Design a protein around this ligand. Structure first.
Ligand code: K
Lengths: 236, 241, 248, 237, 196, 242, 213, 201, 216
């Protein structure tokens, strides 16, 4: 009858592909742009908060996960919150059992397994959300990207969401500088990458940008409308 | 294998090629069939208004409640399939009272909206327990109330996205009411002006003529609690239009 | 798997349950079973469809099932579902007896079995019980009773009804000929034989093709007795005489 | 256990299974309910007039409690199930809250049950619409209905089943402050509402009445005939 | 310890119960009613361990009322007694047993007057008269001495007052007032309390 | 060939082919090739791990897992399923050591994980794993072992194997080796040679060679190849590729 | 047989003020007629405006402290704000009653600033009942700390004395004095006294030494 | 611990002490033993303090849920039955809750006594606690349904004072409450040190 | 373990400048009987921490199995992060508390010693989950016999060298052998440094009996 390869997550296309995974990837691609970076001492997430209407406050996109780690969501927000709750629970469990912060890579591995589980069962659906995970642990600043395919990447900078390719191009051309940047110019690079996504008729304002930074001696802190101004001044 | 209809060729948790859950989009379409609701968050209160949509004169408007009380400091205006809104209202009330029981403090409006919104995509098939929901809630809710941060207004759709809105209109006439609220909203407008503006918009969008028995209006001020206006109290503002 | 699901417990676009309707067609093709409520008894008459002379018929009956001390039932439809339903009926009657130490009222047993059938047409995806039953009983509340049941879980108190092949014609004849509150056991038996004559048109109504059981009250004890071959033969012969006398 | 999603959202936001349950309701026998000053009246059409039937066993008006009673349109067996759960809930509420259930409470319970079947896995919606009538403890008469979708509203007078629209229009045109002045006027209003759709008068009407501090009373056929005769004289003039 | 008594006449069941609810050396209540009207013609006189009594009586009351509403006809006193016995016996070996001593008085159009006796083990016994508590020891001798199967209701009240006077004279506990109810073909009738 | 009988692993084609498993194999042959060669004193793995974007860190999306203190694992296909199977193999080895009190033989770990992946080739409620993987171990009392498990769940021992897009070319060039007589220090060099031969620089632009051996050189511990040895192997592979 | 609880000694004390809160505890950790460590402080920092003292079985003290920290993190994540002192007290009552039938053998005192900048001292029992107090002393030497605080801070049984408001300077001296007297008569208290002062700037922390044996 | 509650023409008076003991040690002299369940219904803390507090807080939660669902305020009988059922679910597990639930509902003033043992009895005069007997004494010698508000106040104060005087485990301040048709009011927090001077002349 | 079967006696531990040293004898006693005379009661959890356990040797073996497997999985991950001695102590405390709460205690009292990030760690944990850190730890009869000497040395001299700490441990174990009925002469000494964990044994402590002739 119908395309018979698209509805179920447990049905392989004759091309060796699962179309539900790709549709969840599209769900991520339809979300608003997020871009993250990392120096040798900091890992910054800056997100382009999108507004439903001119009278609606923009969606929160950076979410706290632990004392030392944070995420930037892009996709289905309910899936994002469920996965964020799982991350928070794992971090709290690690602090309870071992009295140490949970390493970022192991947390991302847990996320990968948890999101792979629905990839293989009937009735289940992939987590239609992509997460930019920036955290700081003993192994220096970390930034991670997780896809609905349950495949996660150890990045040096990444942008996911709508019109992400321009931000990725900017990040690629300016990768060589990020390591030696300080926090201010690192978040300036992030803001430039995020601006590369925006159309010609809009520019960054304190309303539609949020910044989350985690570093060597820095609590993970989400910077909001008023607090974004010191990072915003000096771009163009 | 015949007589099978394409109504159930897809699962509930299936994505469209554009990456949107089919059931969520269909629930959003169902929202556009509900009664129009309007909410405005001013600095001295939050007002919520909704048309009753009385089908026949034999139906008593007092029974058809489309605005409810989560607690003394939170309200909720509902549009869509009002039958599905009651589960979410009960969950919100339970969460508010649990928060008071555990912490001895009023639960933040944002926290209540978040707690209710987590239920939105908690639906599925055999993968879950027998008590699991089978379909998304066909209700959009306008949570409004006062808390430590001041007057707050929120909007939750079946997708589970909850967003803070200065002035939001939901229901059949969402687009026109939203354009009008764009035209009328100022960040420093008073609660009386908010109430009058909301009733004006409802009159503009309602098919029935605006009167004291075919709308419901409620306010949540930083002082007094959630308050439902009545006759002899809604005429006093309807007359001005 | 949704692909192979038959969707038994769903609604039709026009608002009807196809599975119940199909089971009802199956029952309508099944053996004729009619019951008549009399002033001093209630009887079940059932066409036997397996007439082949290599059958033994060891048991008490082939259509009439004794449900408790004070009640009996017949079946039109699928025999195996009939067996599971009659076992469940016996369990329900004995559960009331255990709980209250008194016989179960007939309508309560009918209601319990019909509730089970409703459960099978409400949830679970299982096909309904394609069995329509025909209950006869007695209790200290409403006296002699006759009850019909449907696969959908519907039931009705009837004073004369027929389920099975040629049920409509039998119902029409019963409506024409049943006398309200004035029908004795012998009158009801004669009417049953007459109705079965015009219902089993092809089979010519031998006494080997019908199973009749009467529920009467004797000395405060209910007696459910399957009519013997001799006396069913006598009933048939009397009806033949009456039919011949009609020509006079 | 069966866990398929029977009721799912269709395009344009319709729940087809609920609409089909409503269609099944539309094919049920007409049921009318009117709320008076000191009496509440329920009336049902009997298409099953067949004379070889025990009228007691096919009653479509059931007493949920001493002060609440209901009439239904749609599937009979689903109505039996809902009535049984409503009676159980009435008695449970009377144990736990010490007082008799208000009409709106059992109406909310029935509506919630129907809505839960609308949204839970592996069961179809109840194909019944109800008319829950009764008196509150404070002596205020009430009248509600519960559609298969689970929405419940309060009505001064309503009709469910076939000819609901016709009887609803008749009640709209004939429900005034004078038409419910006395008990007999309410009885005649309900009978007149049914006569707009029933094939023949009297023989196809089941009419139960509830008044203050008295249980439900099933009006016998003789009373229905005498009332219908009274409407006949009233219509002559 | 609480007190119950029942006297089955030819056409009635006279039941009386003390009204004292003490939870210490002090009596907290002096107008306690330990009779439960399960139906229009059934009374359940429940005594025993606190909490269990009210919960069990209300459970049986809910179920009897549900039977009435579900069927349209009341349970007979025999049927209600057997239902009560079945529930108590089922809970006997459960994790939450009910420690209650019961008297089930009732009238039926056919069976006539009925009086039933149930101990906390759920041992049912139809008796012409029965009693519970430590006052049963003092009063059952008088019941044996003076009861006859054809006792009138006025003579039954006199005999019951004799029993209560015996309690007042030779029983340590102070039970000043007793409720009195009679179940006749007309239903449950409240008689004047016997006080001292 | 299909369109009616390829909807579930719980369905047989008219000619007895489970098409879903074959589609999983189709998935695994569209991934970068991972090769493993067994020699006298261990097994050396090799992966042509493609770098999809240069924004990734060196070492992202590793395809050479470490499932127990003495067992390695090379993967091809979907990486999510590869990681899930790596965790399954880790859990199997952990349970074996907990119950029987010693290290799991690779001949048993391969069988256990192969049966686990076979359990997903039978039911309509699950889907076959889209990853074929290799396992390699060396113990003094059992020698060097190399096994492959594919989505069907078949386990065979190999003196050398390849999984991915360039399986055929990699096997053709591996056969030219005489691995039965060689040692790990040379097999790593040859594995780099094979990976660089089978790689195409025109379709997939860039890749980083990920190597790891387990053997007598490492006392049975499966370790990533030291950085200097990887540099020497890549130098030899580039010079040979001329 | 097996006894899950051992009394590990330790005394805690909290005094609330107009703009401060003092929480003090000994560092002695004991078991039977033995000393485990002389540097086990029993005052834990929850927020910048809350410090909790735990005395009793040390295992339950540690577990309860970690549960409280996890719950503050949960509340901050869910509601995007820190947990006020009264909310912490109510949550601790609920947590303690979560194990009513296997009670924590922990005596709890929560001292910190309320939302109006004043001191707040909340006392607890093992099963969870709490009330707001001007001052409370818990642990082994509670019976020896409490009467003197009643006489001085509460000014009870004292006539013709003006009820001077309590200051930080006098409260610290009184805490030090009551603990020096407690060590001289209670075998479980001593080896150090850690005082935590909850003030608008933050949590200060002193340590005064008192006798070892 | 002594608490009392009695109904009269102008509501129900609730009075309680403020002493909590752990053995012979006086843990606190300022225990608030009248649990303000909600502005229209009071509670009493007698027995295990944490038990009464927790279960009456759950009662408050359930009552507020009831008011939200049903749009009408819960009756004293319903709240008492809720508490009795909740506690009876834990029979024999060691709960030591004994409470007097007070309020004014559509059936006039309401007073119920609920304990962990399972009792639920209404009444016009109740007093639960260790010093409950000394409260019964003078409360019964002074009670009359036609009492004035001031006379009822003084009766409750004197009853709690005498209970404190005799019982060693009862003492502290005499908190007194008055439940009227529009809620309850805290009238006094008199200390027995001052009451001794008032009553000794 | 509601009742122990074969029990190990005191386990010692003292911090020093550059690591910690823990000593425990090689005996598993079945009550009074000295059944198993060469069992090792010191575990090398990883390169940075070690664990000496008194109490039931069966529960110690189970916990040794669990910890070893956990360290194996940690090494399998191969992501640089490794369990600190503090992390092992916290996990051990949580495990023992969870086991007491289920009324199935692990009848061990354990001494965790480690050296990570240039800091010496000495940790205590018992069957009831009581945990703390001290410069010197003694378990069982060592707390009454050996711990006084450790404290009287570390109070005067807060920091000890490796040789001083080793000598003090040897003296304390000599005292324990003198005055503990469940002691054994043979014992091991394990030290953590920057170099790792080294276990030396079977060591024997010299004893003096010259007061035998005095007693008459
Ligand atoms: K001391």
């Amino acid at each position: 009858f119908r395309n018979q390869y698209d509805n179920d997550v447990t049905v392989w296309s004759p091309q060796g592909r699962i179309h539900q995974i790709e549709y969840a990837m599209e769900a991520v691609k339809q979300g608003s742009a997020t871009v993250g970076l990392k120096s040798k001492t900091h890992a910054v997430l800056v997100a382009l908060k999108r507004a439903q209407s001119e009278l609606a406050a923009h969606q929160k996109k950076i979410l706290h996960v632990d004392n030392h780690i944070g995420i930037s969501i892009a996709g289905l927000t309910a899936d994002a919150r469920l996965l964020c709750n799982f991350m928070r629970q794992e971090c709290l469990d690690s602090r309870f059992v071992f009295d140490r912060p949970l390493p970022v890579s192991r947390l991302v591995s847990l996320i990968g397994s948890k999101t792979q589980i629905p990839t293989q069962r009937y009735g289940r659906r992939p987590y239609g959300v992509g997460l930019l995970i920036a955290g700081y642990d003993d192994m220096g600043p970390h930034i991670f990207q997780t896809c609905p395919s349950a495949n996660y990447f150890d990045c040096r900078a990444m942008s996911i969401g709508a019109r992400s390719q321009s931000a990725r191009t900017y990040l690629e051309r300016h990768m060589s500088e990020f390591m030696e940047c300080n926090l201010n110019e690192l978040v300036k690079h992030g803001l430039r990458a995020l601006r590369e996504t925006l159309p010609a008729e809009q520019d960054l304002t304190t309303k539609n940008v949020s910044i989350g930074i985690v570093g060597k001696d820095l609590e993970f802190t989400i910077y909001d409308d008023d607090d974004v101004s010191p990072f915003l001044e000096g771009l163009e | 294998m015949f007589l099978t209809r394409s109504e159930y060729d897809r699962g509930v948790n299936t994505f469209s090629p554009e990456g949107r859950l089919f059931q969520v989009e269909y629930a959003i379409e169902a929202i556009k069939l509900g009664s129009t609701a309007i909410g405005i968050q001013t600095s001295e209160g939050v007002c919520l208004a909704v048309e009753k949509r009385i089908t026949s004169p034999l139906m008593e408007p007092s029974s058809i409640e489309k605005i409810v009380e989560i607690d003394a400091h939170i309200g909720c205006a509902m549009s869509g399939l009002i039958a599905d809104a009651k589960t979410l209202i009960d969950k919100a009330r339970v969460e508010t009272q649990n928060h008071w029981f555990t912490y001895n403090e009023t639960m933040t409006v944002e926290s209540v909206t978040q707690a209710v919104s987590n239920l939105a995509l908690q639906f599925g098939e055999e993968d879950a327990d027998p008590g699991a929901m089978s379909r998304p809630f066909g209700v959009a809710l306008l949570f409004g109330g006062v808390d430590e941060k001041g007057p707050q207004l929120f909007h939750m759709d079946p997708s589970g996205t909850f967003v803070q809105c200065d002035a939001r209109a939901i229901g059949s006439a969402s687009e026109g009411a939203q354009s009008s609220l764009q035209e009328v909203y100022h960040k420093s407008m008073t609660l009386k002006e908010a109430i009058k503006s909301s009733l004006i918009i409802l009159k503009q969008v309602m098919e029935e003529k605006l009167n004291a028995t075919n709308i419901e209006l409620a306010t949540v001020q930083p002082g007094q609690n959630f308050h439902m206006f009545t006759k002899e109290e809604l005429e006093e503002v309807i007359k001005d239009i | 798997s949704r692909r192979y699901d038959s969707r038994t417990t769903i609604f039709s676009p026009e608002g009807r349950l196809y599975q119940v309707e199909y089971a009802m067609e199956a029952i309508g093709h099944a053996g004729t079973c009619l019951g008549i409520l009399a002033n001093d008894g209630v009887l079940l008459a059932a066409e036997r469809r397996n007439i082949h002379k290599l059958l033994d018929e060891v048991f008490f009956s082939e259509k009439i099932y004794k449900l408790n001390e004070d009640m009996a039932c017949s079946v039109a439809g699928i025999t195996s579902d009939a067996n599971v339903l009659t076992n469940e009926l016996r369990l329900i009657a004995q559960r009331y007896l255990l709980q209250y130490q008194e016989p179960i009222p007939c309508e309560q047993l009918v209601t319990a079995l019909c509730d089970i059938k409703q459960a099978y047409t409400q949830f679970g995806g299982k096909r309904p019980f394609g069995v329509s039953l025909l209950y006869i009983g007695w209790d200290k509340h409403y006296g002699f009773q006759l009850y019909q049941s449907d696969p959908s879980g519907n039931y009705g108190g009837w004073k004369a009804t027929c389920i099975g092949n040629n049920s409509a014609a039998a119902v029409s004849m019963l409506k024409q000929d049943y006398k309200e509150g004035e029908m004795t056991l012998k009158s009801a038996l004669a009417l049953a034989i007459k109705v079965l004559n015009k219902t089993m048109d092809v089979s010519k109504l031998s006494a080997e093709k019908v199973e009749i059981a009467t529920l009467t009250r004797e000395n405060g004890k209910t007696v459910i007795r399957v009519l013997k071959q001799k006396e069913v033969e006598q009933l048939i012969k009397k009806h033949e005489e009456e039919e011949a006398k009609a020509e006079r | 256990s069966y866990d398929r999603a029977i009721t799912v959202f269709s395009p344009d936001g319709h729940l087809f299974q609920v609409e089909y349950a409503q269609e099944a309701v539309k094919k049920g026998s007409t049921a009318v309910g009117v709320r008076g000053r000191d009496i509440v009246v329920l009336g049902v059409e009997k298409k099953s007039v067949a004379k070889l039937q025990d009228e007691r066993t096919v009653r479509k008006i059931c007493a949920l409690d001493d002060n609440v009673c209901m009439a239904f349109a749609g599937l009979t067996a689903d109505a039996r199930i809902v009535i049984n759960r409503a009676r159980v809930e009435c008695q449970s509420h009377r144990l736990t809250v010490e007082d008799p259930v208000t009409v709106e409470y059992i109406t909310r319970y029935i509506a919630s049950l129907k809505q839960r079947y609308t949204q839970s896995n592996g069961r179809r919606p109840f194909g019944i619409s109800a008319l829950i009538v009764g008196f509150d403890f404070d002596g205020t008469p009430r009248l509600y209905q519960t559609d298969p979708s689970g929405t419940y509203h309060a009505w001064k007078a309503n009709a469910i089943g076939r000819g609901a629209k016709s009887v609803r229009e008749f009640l709209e045109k004939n429900y005034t402050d004078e038409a419910i002045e006395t008990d007999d006027l309410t009885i005649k209003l309900v009978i007149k509402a049914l006569l707009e759709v029933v094939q023949s008068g009297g023989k196809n009407i089941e009419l139960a009445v509830m008044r203050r501090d008295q249980s439900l009373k099933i009006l016998n056929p003789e009373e229905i005939e005498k009332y219908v005769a009274e409407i006949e004289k009233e219509k002559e003039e | 310890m609480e007190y119950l008594i029942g006297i089955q006449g030819p056409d009635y069941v006279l039941v009386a119960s003390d009204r004292v609810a003490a939870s210490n050396i002090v009596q907290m209540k002096d107008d306690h009613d330990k009779m439960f009207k399960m139906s229009e013609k059934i009374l359940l006189l429940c005594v025993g361990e606190a909490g269990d009594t009210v919960q069990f009586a209300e459970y049986i009351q809910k179920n009897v009322q549900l039977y009435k509403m579900r069927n349209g006809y009341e349970l007979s006193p025999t049927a209600a007694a057997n239902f009560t016995r079945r529930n108590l016996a089922d809970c006997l070996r459960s994790r939450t047993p009910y420690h209650v001593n019961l008297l089930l008085a009732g009238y039926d159009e056919h069976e006539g007057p009925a009086l039933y006796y149930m101990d906390y083990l759920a041992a049912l016994a139809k008796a012409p008269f029965a009693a519970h508590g430590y006052g049963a020891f003092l009063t059952l001798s008088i019941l044996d001495r003076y009861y006859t199967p054809t006792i009138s209701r006025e003579r039954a009240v006199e005999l019951l007052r004799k029993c209560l006077e015996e309690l007042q004279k030779r029983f340590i506990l102070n039970l000043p007032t007793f409720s009195v109810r009679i179940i006749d073909k007309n239903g449950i009738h409240d008689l004047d309390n016997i006080s001292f | 060939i299909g369109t009616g009988y390829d909807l579930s692993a719980s369905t047989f084609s008219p000619d007895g082919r489970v098409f879903q498993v074959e589609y999983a194999m189709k998935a695994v042959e569209n991934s970068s090739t991972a090769i493993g060669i067994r020699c006298k004193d261990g097994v050396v793995f090799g992966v042509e791990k493609l770098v999809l974007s240069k924004l990734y860190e060196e070492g992202s999306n590793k395809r050479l897992f470490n499932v127990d203190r003495h067992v390695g694992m090379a993967v091809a296909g979907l990486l999510a399923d590869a990681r899930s199977l790596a965790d399954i193999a880790r859990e199997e080895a952990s349970n074996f050591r907990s119950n029987f009190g010693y290290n799991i033989p690779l001949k048993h770990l391969a069988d256990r994980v192969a049966m686990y992946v076979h359990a997903y080739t039978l039911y309509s409620a699950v889907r076959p794993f889209g990853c074929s993987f290799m396992l390699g171990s060396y113990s003094v009392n059992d020698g060097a072992q190399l096994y492959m498990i594919d989505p069907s769940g078949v386990s065979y021992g190999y003196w050398g194997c390849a999984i991915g897009k360039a399986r055929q070319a990699a096997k053709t060039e591996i056969e030219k080796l005489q691995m039965k007589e060689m040692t790990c220090r040379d097999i790593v060099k040859e594995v780099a040679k094979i990976i660089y031969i089978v790689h195409d620089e025109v379709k997939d632009k860039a890749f980083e060679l990920e190597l790891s051996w387990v053997g007598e050189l490492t006392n049975g511990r499966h370790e990533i190849v030291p950085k200097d040895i990887r540099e020497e192997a890549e130098k030899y592979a580039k010079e040979s590729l001329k | 047989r097996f006894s899950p609880y051992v009394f590990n000694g330790g005394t805690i004390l909290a005094i609330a003020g107009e703009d401060f809160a003092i929480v003090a505890s000994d560092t002695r950790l004991s078991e039977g007629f033995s000393i485990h460590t002389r540097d086990s402080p029993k005052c834990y920092k929850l927020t910048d405006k809350t410090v909790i003292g735990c005395s009793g079985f040390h295992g339950d003290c540690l577990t309860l402290t970690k549960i409280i920290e996890a719950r503050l993190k949960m509340y901050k994540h869910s509601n995007n704000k820190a947990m006020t002192t009264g909310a912490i007290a109510a949550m601790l009552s609920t947590i303690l009653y979560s194990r009513r039938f296997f009670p924590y053998y922990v005596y709890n005192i929560i001292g910190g600033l309320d939302e109006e900048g004043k001191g707040a001292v909340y006392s607890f029992d093992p099963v969870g009942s709490y009330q707001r107090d001007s001052f409370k002393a818990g642990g082994s030497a509670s019976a020896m700390l409490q009467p003197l605080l009643d006489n001085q801070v509460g000014f009870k049984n004292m006539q013709n004395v003006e009820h001077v408001p309590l200051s930080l300077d006098r409260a610290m001296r009184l805490v030090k004095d009551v603990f020096i007297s407690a060590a001289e008569r209670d075998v479980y208290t001593g080896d150090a006294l850690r005082i935590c002062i909850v003030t608008k700037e933050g949590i200060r922390e002193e340590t005064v030494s008192l006798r070892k044996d | 611990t002594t608490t009392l509650a009695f109904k009269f023409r102008h509501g129900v008076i609730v009075a309680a002490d403020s002493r909590a003991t752990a053995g012979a040690y006086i843990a606190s002299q300022t225990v608030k033993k009248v649990i303000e369940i909600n502005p229209y219904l009071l509670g009493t803390m007698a027995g295990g303090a944490a038990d009464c507090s927790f279960w009456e807080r759950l009662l408050a939660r359930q009552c507020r849920i009831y008011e939200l669902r049903n749009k009408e305020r819960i009756s004293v009988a319903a709240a008492s039955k809720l508490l009795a059922n909740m506690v009876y679910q834990y029979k024999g597990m060691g709960l030591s809750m004994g409470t007097m639930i007070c309020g004014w509902d559509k059936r006039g003033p309401g007073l119920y006594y609920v304990d962990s043992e399972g009792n639920r009895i209404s009444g016009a005069t109740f007093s639960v606690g260790s010093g409950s007997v000394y409260a019964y004494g003078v409360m019964d010698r002074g009670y009359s349904y036609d009492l004035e508000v001031e006379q009822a106040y003084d009766l409750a104060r004197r009853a709690i004072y005498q209970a404190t005087y005799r019982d060693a485990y009862s003492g502290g301040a005499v908190n007194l409450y008055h439940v009227r048709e529009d809620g309850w009011i805290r009238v006094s927090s008199d200390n027995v040190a001052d009451l001794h001077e008032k009553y000794s002349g | 373990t509601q009742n122990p079967m074969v029990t190990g006696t005191s386990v010692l531990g003292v911090k020093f400048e550059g690591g910690v040293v823990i000593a425990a004898d090689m005996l598993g006693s079945y009550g009074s009987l000295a059944r198993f005379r060469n069992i090792s009661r010191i575990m090398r959890v990883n390169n940075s921490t070690m664990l000496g356990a008194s109490g039931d040797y069966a529960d110690f073996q189970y916990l040794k199995q669990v910890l070893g497997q956990m360290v194996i999985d940690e090494e399998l991950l191969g992501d640089g992060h490794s369990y600190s001695p503090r992390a092992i102590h916290s996990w051990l405390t949580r495990a023992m508390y969870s086991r007491r709460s289920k009324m199935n205690p692990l009848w061990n009292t354990m001494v965790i010693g480690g050296y990570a990030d240039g800091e010496s760690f000495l940790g205590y944990v018992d069957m009831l989950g009581v945990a703390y850190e001290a410069p010197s730890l003694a378990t069982g009869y060592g707390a009454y016999l050996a711990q006084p000497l450790l404290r009287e040395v570390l109070e005067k001299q807060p920091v000890l060298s490796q040789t001083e700490a080793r000598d003090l441990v040897e003296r304390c174990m000599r005292v324990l052998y003198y005055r503990d009925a469940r002691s054994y002469n043979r014992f091991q000494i394990a030290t953590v440094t920057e170099k790792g964990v080294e276990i030396e044994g079977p060591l024997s402590t010299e004893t003096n009996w010259d007061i035998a002739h005095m007693i008459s």
